[PDB]
Design a protein around this ligand. Structure first.
Ligand SMILES: Nc1ncnc2c1ncn2[C@@H]1O[C@H](COP(=O)(O)OP(=O)(O)OP(=O)(O)O)C[C@H]1O
Ligand code: SF4
Ligand SMILES: [Zn+2]
Ligand SMILES: [Zn+2]
Ligand SMILES: [Zn+2]
Lengths: 512, 495, 97, 39, 158, 86
RNA sequence: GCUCGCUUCG
DNA sequence: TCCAATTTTAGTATATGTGCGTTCGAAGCGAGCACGGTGTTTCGTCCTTTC
DNA sequence: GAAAGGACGAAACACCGTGCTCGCTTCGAACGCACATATACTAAAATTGGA
């Protein structure tokens, strides 16, 4: 996981600083370790180690556990540091599904990690008072309504609460309070009757204290998986099937967990009555849609029962496997061409196959199909079976069969995407550092205008800004800006493939 | 004006930290890339080719042609390495056992180590203790390997992990789809039934469907090692700063400088004398070129894998020229000297060049009895005394003696042969030039290579040594005869 | 070299080294096996631990941490051969004090 | 160890190299320091 | 036909242009049929059935085209359509039909339809790092570095 | 037999396949702008701990004018173990 | 000059 | 529900095919050094026909 | 007895494959001794079945 460690290092350096990213990388590479050995191995002062650990545990990046002799050990969550990159996508999806109020709520929750409901509603009101003008004030009522609406949909979840010290072992305080998680009050918001109005940044006791909230990334991952499945089935059959499967997944969201081979089955009557009335679709049309989706060779849905009219179920693991297969065939096509993608799909459909059979089934002339096969072998896109006639395993007396393993190829592609995003971040930081001189020059020449904006603002300071030598350098500035924009766009768009591969790898494990 | 930089520091080596180099570090350390399989040019001068083997940018091996990287002669050139890229990765014969061990330690699907969280914490706490020794490290590795081989299913991803063993030579087989006498799992049944097209097009696949386990070629092994989490690296008893699991599989070969590969220009015939390492590297480059040619021309998979196995075998012979599992048809015709053979043996580097090495300022002569000498004195012939010289520094005490010694010259027995000045280190031969002027200009601190005279402490030894008394330091007395003479009473120690 | 026809010198074998060890003469053993036989001065970089040339490290592309060091030439040959065998010896130098 | 001392070309710790020698030079440890007037 | 001759082989020379023209014409015909089926919008089942094209139908269409002089059998067009399926552009379904104008397979008929790809090109291929052939030799400090990369330089310049 | 090569292969070999252009739309641009805003706003956040500057040359009257002032968040010591208190 | 073999020497 | 039999499950304990060693040196010589299999370019020398 | 234009053949670079004309093919260990890895298999623990 060297690429993962490098990506986490880059993210922590760009987001938190230097003295904290070292502690984070040490925790990721060495695992759970007490505080003193961490401070000894890192080589910095104890106070910096404490500050780094506290700022990491605030954003739920690391956790602390008790062990023998009452020692506390800190373990980092590399998965959480990787999910940190998905913050823009989380904000975009919470702005799409909800209003801008929930957008600011999720933004503050991600930027602070753990906060109380009063604090987040106060911050959201203070930030939204700037959006509007003309003396209109922001009340806490609608903000609390949006917060509880996010809560009941499991998008925001209460942080693990420390048990009561008086009731649980009253006496000597333990080194760690041993925070536990309770599912009863996991999504129960507190009753806060206090309201207020946000201030407009003029620059001229807590009822919900102890109750901290955070963003439930599992709900966002489930929503992204549902959106991906809906987009896939829309590209496959039609938008009507996409709406049907969207309604089915919306019904299944509550009654199912985040990891299950099959969801709870639904009947045709409840799917019909739950479908939005905007579609002029009858019962028989829905029955035909369901029975034609069940006959799809992709197995997105399944019958799995006949009671209650049309009883149907949705295959989540099969859909994720199909999405991973589509991603792999797409990257193969874009990296080696359409003919190599044809050979890949041939060797994927046929579990085991040889060179002559590949040439016969793909109709690709010799000296070229073998070349693409060897190129895919050199990139770990497939593995040879190598069935031996004799245990000597001599090449002249054995058969070589080509076979694509989806799991290993998906892991390799995920590692490649991690290293790609790491290289993109490195290139962006290099371009920023090499041009920091022009950046400071432009910042100064623009702060000349930013200073004395209204008070003592003579017009004689507007025709001298572009008089300097910065005007021919504005072209280099624009090139740097567009390069950074494109790098960030690519880094964000690779995160979708990363999410797909990570979901495929997670849902195929048992964790026994 | 002038920046202060230290000229020389009395640096003393504290300890040697062994480790491994990644292919990127191999590229960074090397200066040039060797791609030409030939040695010399087509012209009659037979100059070494550029970017090929025997190139002078990687040091020099001839007294006339200097190095191209550093402008120094053969005596001052320390040598430079090169890097050769391989089309297909090959297992390192030295770390092949380590490769098998690591493959047995970690899972073959998620690359995680076969250890539960409690066992992971226990092993980490056992390893975090200070003063960990080599024996303790090897014992911990053995224990963790046993506890990993005890398990059969993965606690991280849930994939099955069968036995991993060595089949043939430099080939690894993982028994993922093992035969189950009880109710069979769905995975093995799906694997068996996935051969439908293969059986339809080739019936021979059906009888040989059994024993079809996973074959871990260097590509898949390298891909798995590149995805190993850094947290599990200390659990493999391998130092993270020393190396990484991906370094065990070699993709670049470090061709050594010309100092390790001396070349003899035998002008008596139309050929040159080269060591075995140069020929092995030439064969490896030729195999890489042949593999590339077959990949371009679209050859069959059987011959491609045969060329890959031949390249692996040639790399192993370049590393260790004495293997056991070499096939008879793939066995070498002649005998070559690999690095292992150059290291081990009675004539190796450790025993022949490190523990015991030849020195100068020494002689060997037949002995004869002489009872008229003391037991702590030994007679040295005049002829040997004129050759074995001692460097005496000119001081305020022996100035008038060294003056007369220089005046006598290298012909008279009491005298010297060379004078090294204090300011300049240019030696001066006393056989030429006015010796009187040199004697009159003997400054304090000069070195005079005086002849062996009476009173000099000299080691005297018999080469067959049983105890320490076989070699003793005596006082040299010069005699006109030609034998080493000493008191016979000291005959019993020397035997 | 080895032979008299090749004008070679005598060889202090392993047992001679054992006798010199038993006597405890460390300076004489050092002068015989290092100074008088295969003495050389190499350049080692204190950052990466590799061998440099002419006070320059090609690996790190710097020369501030390169320092001279006395060594038997056979030891340098062994280090180079080990580097060829992917067994990289990293030398951590320090002051003699 | 002795073998590594012989290989690396450094004096071995056993024998005469177990101890260190000091020079009985005319000196004065902790010499008088020039006083600082401005501080 | 296996040891010598064949509709594709001409004087021991594989005709790549011929199979390319066949693939292009078959894909154009299937795409036009799917477009007509979509624009018909009479009924989704009827639309899917009309978008389907039998092997005999496309074989007769190719024979009507007459691109080459060599006679193309039905199984030749079937193999061409299978290669098109392997290209990720069309989809084939085996339906049950006892007898009809095709009569090729006993009780089974293969219907082919042009289908759009599942997803657009991924974000990885839009970056030079994803299509680099020397991606393995990438390193921070060395000859091949992202700072001095030529691929990303030409990509940003373009 | 394969031919001999006089010069090493290029450090960056050319490829006939180019990366697919990035997806366009209001969503991608909004996500890019939001990521840039997060980059700009998270460095000034008190969670972003900077390297403590040291080795001040002299003390001056202008120190109070150039003294960097920034509010510091107070961690909840109830949840955090006792070992991280200053 | 490298290697190997024989041969002697104590 | 409880005592007896079947299985499995790992550990242990006796083999049998591997890899590693086998004194210090010193001095001479005789040999051969990677090549060879033949396909092709070049040069020369000599079967008859000409003075 | 000297000569010449054309012809053959003999010798030395040199491209290709891989030290053996074909595909075969042996013997002997060199001798001890500490690691082992395959098998094998023994016994007991555990759980299903009959009374
Ligand atoms: N192979 C060897 N290893 C070590 N030393 C040897 C060897 N061959 C000879 N020597 C030297 O020669 C000496 C052997 O002589 P030794 O055996 O005591 O008398 P000898 O040869 O039996 O004479 P006699 O036959 O008794 O007249 C001792 C040893 O230093
Ligand atoms: S050369 Fe540049 S673009 Fe290509 S893989 Fe390396 S860093 Fe990425
Ligand atoms: Zn050099
Ligand atoms: Zn696993
Ligand atoms: Zn260095």
């Amino acid at each position: 996981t060297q690429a993962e460690i490098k990506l986490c290092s880059l993210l922590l350096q760009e987001h938190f600083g230097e003295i904290v990213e070292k502690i984070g990388v040490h925790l990721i590479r060495t695992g759970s370790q007490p505080l003193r050995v961490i401070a000894h191995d890192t080589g910095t002062s104890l106070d910096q180690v404490k500050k780094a650990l506290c700022v990491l545990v605030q954003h739920n990046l690391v956790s602390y556990q008790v062990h023998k002799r009452g020692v506390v050990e800190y373990e980092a969550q590399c998965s959480r540091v990787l999910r940190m990159l998905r913050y823009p996508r989380y904000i975009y999806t919470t702005k799409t599904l909800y209003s801008d109020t929930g957008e600011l709520i999720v933004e503050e929750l991600l930027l602070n990690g753990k906060l109380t409901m009063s604090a987040v509603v106060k911050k959201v009101a203070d930030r939204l008072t700037e959006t509007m003008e003309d003396g209109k004030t922001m009340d806490y009522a609608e903000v609390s309504n949006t917060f509880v609406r996010l809560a009941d949909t499991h998008f925001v979840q209460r942080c693990p609460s420390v048990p009561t010290t008086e009731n649980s072992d009253p006496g000597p305080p333990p080194p760690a309070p041993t925070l536990v998680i309770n599912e009863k009050d996991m999504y129960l918001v507190p009753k806060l009757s206090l309201i207020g109005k946000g201030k407009r940044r003029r620059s001229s006791p807590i009822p919900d204290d102890g109750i901290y909230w955070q963003a439930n990334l599992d709900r966002f991952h489930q929503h992204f998986r549902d959106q991906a499945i809906v987009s896939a089935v829309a590209n496959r059959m039609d938008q009507t099937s996409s709406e049907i499967v969207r309604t089915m997944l919306r019904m299944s969201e509550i009654t199912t967990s985040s990891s299950a081979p099959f969801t709870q089955p639904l009947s045709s009557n409840e799917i019909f009555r739950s479908l939005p009335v905007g579609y002029n679709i009858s019962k028989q049309v829905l029955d035909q849609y369901l029975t034609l989706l069940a006959d799809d060779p992709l197995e997105f849905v399944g019958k799995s029962g006949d009671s209650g009219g049309g009883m149907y179920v949705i295959n989540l693991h099969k859909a994720l496997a199909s999405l991973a297969t589509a991603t792999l065939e797409s990257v193969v096509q874009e990296r080696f061409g359409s003919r190599c993608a044809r050979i890949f799909r041939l060797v994927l459909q046929k579990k085991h196959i040889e060179q002559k059979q590949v040439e016969d089934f793909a109709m690709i002339p010799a000296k070229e199909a073998k070349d693409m096969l060897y190129k895919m072998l050199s990139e770990n896109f497939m593995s040879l079976q190598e069935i031996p006639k004799t245990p000597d395993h001599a090449p002249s007396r054995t058969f070589y069969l080509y076979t694509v393993n989806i799991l290993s190829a998906a892991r390799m592609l995920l590692h490649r995407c991690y290293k790609s995003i790491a290289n993109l971040i490195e290139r962006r930081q290099f371009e920023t550092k090499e041009n920091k001189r022009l950046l400071e020059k432009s910042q100064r020449v623009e702060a000349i205008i930013a200073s004395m904006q209204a008070t003592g603002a003579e017009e004689a300071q507007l025709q001298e800004i572009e008089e300097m030598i910065t005007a021919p350098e504005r072209q280099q500035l624009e090139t740097l800006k567009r390069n950074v924009n494109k790098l960030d766009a690519s880094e964000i768009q690779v995160d979708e493939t990363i999410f797909l591969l990570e979901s495929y790898i997670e849902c195929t494990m048992k964790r026994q | 004006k002038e920046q202060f930089r230290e000229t020389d520091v009395a640096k003393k080596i504290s300890h040697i930290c062994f480790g491994m180099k990644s292919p990127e570090e191999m590229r960074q350390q090397a200066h040039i890339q060797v791609v030409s399989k030939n040695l010399y040019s087509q012209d009659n001068q037979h100059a070494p080719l550029l970017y090929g083997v025997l190139d002078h940018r990687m040091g020099t091996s001839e007294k006339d042609r200097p190095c191209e990287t550093c402008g120094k002669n053969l005596a001052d050139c320390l040598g430079h390495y090169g890097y050769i890229d391989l089309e297909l990765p090959c297992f390192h014969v030295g770390y092949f056992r380590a490769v098998i061990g690591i493959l047995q330690m970690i899972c073959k699907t998620c690359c995680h180590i076969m250890l539960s969280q409690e066992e992971k914490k226990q092993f980490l706490d056992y390893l975090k203790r200070p003063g960990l020794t080599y024996l303790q490290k090897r014992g911990l590795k053995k224990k963790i390997s046993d506890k990993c081989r005890k398990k059969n299913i993965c606690h991280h991803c849930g994939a099955f992990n069968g036995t991993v063993k060595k089949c043939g030579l430099l080939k690894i087989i993982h028994e993922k789809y093992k035969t189950n006498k009880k109710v069979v799992d769905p995975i093995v049944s799906n694997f068996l039934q996935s051969f439908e097209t293969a059986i339809e097009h080739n019936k021979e696949v059906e009888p040989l469907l059994g024993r079809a386990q996973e074959n871990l070629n260097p590509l898949v092994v390298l891909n798995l090692f590149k995805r190993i989490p850094a947290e599990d690296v200390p659990l493999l008893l391998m130092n993270p700063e020393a190396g990484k699991p991906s370094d065990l599989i070699l993709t670049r070969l470090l061709v050594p400088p010309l100092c390790i590969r001396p070349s003899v220009v035998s002008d008596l015939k139309s050929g040159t004398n080269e060591d075995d390492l140069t020929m092995k590297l030439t064969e490896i480059i030729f195999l890489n070129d042949v593999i590339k040619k077959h990949r371009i021309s679209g050859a069959k998979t059987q011959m491609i894998m045969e060329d890959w196995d031949f390249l692996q075998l040639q790399c192993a012979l370049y590393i260790n020229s004495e293997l056991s599992g070499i096939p008879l048809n793939m066995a070498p015709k002649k005998w070559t000297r690999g690095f292992v053979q150059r290291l081990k043996g009675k004539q190796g580097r450790f025993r022949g060049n490190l523990s015991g090495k030849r020195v100068d300022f020494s002689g060997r002569t037949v002995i004869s009895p002489d009872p008229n000498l003391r037991i702590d004195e030994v007679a040295v012939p005049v002829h040997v005394a004129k050759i074995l010289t001692f460097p005496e520094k000119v001081n305020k005490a022996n100035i008038n003696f060294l003056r007369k010694l220089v005046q006598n010259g290298p012909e008279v027995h009491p005298g010297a042969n060379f004078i090294q000045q204090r300011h300049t280190q240019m030696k001066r031969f006393l056989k030429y030039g006015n010796r009187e002027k040199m004697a009159q200009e003997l400054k304090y601190g000069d070195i005079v290579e005086r002849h062996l005279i009476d009173g000099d402490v000299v080691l005297f030894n018999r080469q067959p040594s049983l105890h320490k008394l076989s070699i003793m330091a005596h006082l040299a007395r010069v005699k006109p005869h030609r034998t080493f003479r000493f008191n016979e009473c000291v005959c019993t120690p020397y035997n | 070299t080895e032979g008299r026809s090749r004008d070679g010198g005598l060889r202090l074998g392993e047992m001679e080294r054992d006798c010199l060890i038993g006597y405890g003469a460390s300076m004489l053993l050092l002068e015989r096996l290092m100074i008088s036989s295969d003495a050389f001065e190499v350049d080692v970089c204190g950052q990466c631990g590799l061998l440099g040339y002419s006070g320059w490290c090609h690996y790190c592309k710097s020369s501030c941490h390169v320092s001279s060091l006395r060594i038997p030439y056979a030891c340098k040959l062994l280090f180079q051969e080990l580097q060829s065998m992917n067994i990289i010896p990293r030398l951590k130098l320090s002051k003699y004090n | 160890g002795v073998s590594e001392c012989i290989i690396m070309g450094i004096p071995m710790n056993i024998g005469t190299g177990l101890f260190k020698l000091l020079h009985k030079a005319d000196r004065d440890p902790n010499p008088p320091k020039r006083p600082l007037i401005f501080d | 036909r296996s040891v010598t001759g064949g509709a594709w082989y001409s004087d021991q020379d594989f005709e790549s242009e011929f199979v390319e023209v066949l693939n292009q014409q078959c894909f154009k015909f299937l795409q036009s049929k799917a477009e007509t089926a979509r624009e018909s919008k009479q009924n989704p089942m009827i639309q899917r059935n009309s978008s389907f094209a039998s092997s005999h139908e496309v074989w007769k269409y190719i024979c009507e085209l007459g691109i080459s002089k060599v006679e193309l059998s039905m199984e030749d067009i079937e193999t061409i359509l299978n290669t098109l399926i392997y290209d990720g552009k069309v989809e084939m379904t085996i339906i049950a039909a006892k007898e009809g104008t095709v009569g090729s397979v006993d009780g089974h008929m293969k219907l082919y339809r042009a289908v759009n790809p599942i997803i657009p090109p991924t974000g990885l291929v839009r970056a030079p790092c994803g299509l680099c052939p020397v991606f393995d030799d990438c390193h921070e400090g060395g000859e091949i570095s992202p700072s001095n990369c030529i691929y990303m330089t030409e990509w940003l310049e373009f | 037999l394969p031919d001999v090569v006089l010069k090493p292969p290029p450090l960056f070999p050319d490829t006939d396949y180019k990366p697919v252009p990035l997806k366009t739309g209001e969503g991608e641009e909004y996500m890019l702008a939001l990521k840039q805003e997060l980059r700009e706003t998270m460095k000034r956040m008190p969670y972003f701990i900077e390297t403590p500057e040291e080795r001040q040359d002299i003390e001056r009257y202008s120190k109070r004018y150039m003294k960097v002032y920034k509010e510091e968040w107070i961690p909840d010591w109830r949840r955090l173990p006792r070992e991280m208190m200053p």
